Design a protein around this ligand. Sequence first.
Ligand code: YU6
Ligand code: ZN
Length: 345
Amino acid sequence: GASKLRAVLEKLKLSRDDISTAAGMVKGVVDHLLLRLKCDSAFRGVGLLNTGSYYEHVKISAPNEFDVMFKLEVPRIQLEEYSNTRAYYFVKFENPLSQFLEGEILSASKMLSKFRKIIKEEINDTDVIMKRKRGGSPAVTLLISEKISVDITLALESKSSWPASTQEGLRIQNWLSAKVRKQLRLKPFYLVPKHAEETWRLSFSHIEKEILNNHGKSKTCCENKEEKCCRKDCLKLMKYLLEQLKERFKDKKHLDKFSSYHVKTAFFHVCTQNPQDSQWDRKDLGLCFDNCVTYFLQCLRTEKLENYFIPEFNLFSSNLIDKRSKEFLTKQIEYERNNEFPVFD
Ligand SMILES: Cc1ccc(-c2cc(C(=O)O)c3[nH]c(CN4CCN(Cc5ccccc5)CC4)nc3c2)c(Cl)c1
Ligand SMILES: [Zn+2]
């Protein structure tokens, strides 16, 4: 444990907890968008994923940045792995999405261009302007007033068994048990637009809250005084460590490809590595956060960070992130641990 780390966590808790109208402004915009979308022939079956919450945030230090998902149920889906990528698929199949068919394969580009057209129109009809940024996921980014920012992703939902590329993924059997792994694999999966082309990426982002809210080997982890663990605290600190380094070097482009997602992935790989709750004692926050920082550094150096669900998908391959960018971050983190983590004060 370290006192500095707890002070950072106390600051992050107060920004998250204090009175804010922001969620209300976002709910207003989202509820309005959903109504204009449910009238469209193609987006009629659109539903907000997790209709009840605090809307989900991409940043632990930014209370004004929101992350939202609109899902479309896609029964009787045929998936085809593109170029042996393990995570990117062609979507094959009347139905409402038959309009976006280009032969047999579903067009994401055309679906996103339509989704954008409808949102861009609703923006004019409280001031909400669509941020100029263009990319498949998030499909849309809105700036509400001056401070509030909302990412909106359009995703396809499938209730069929997870694709074969996931068979060895979610290696939680020595931590959460074989019984829990089997229960989670019965949950749906998502397909989001992203190029490896008219390819969709497999997404399991919805599995995170399931694990975070029931994260111990003991069924009573964090339910009493005797069983207080630091797993959630280590993830918040790992995320905050990346966010602060990204902010510091925003004028350069060396940390542009790194995201909270990479930090989450490496963190859950440490959970598999250290499955016992005794390896996560609240008193050992310092050493636990150190095990996290060390593992992430090893990922950067070896250029290896497997998708937690798709083991043959390396998020740190040279083709996705060049070595110079990795070596830059490796140098910045190594500086932070050798200087009592200055980004935290
Ligand atoms: C044990 C475990 C479980 C889950 C994950 C996981 C996996 C994925 C994945 O893609 O498989 C993730 N992706 C991202 C970033 N996304 C940005 C866009 N958001 C849209 C949204 C917004 C609101 C409501 C739904 C959706 C969701 C969060 N964190 C992810 C985390 C990991 Cl690592 C380990
Ligand atoms: Zn716990």
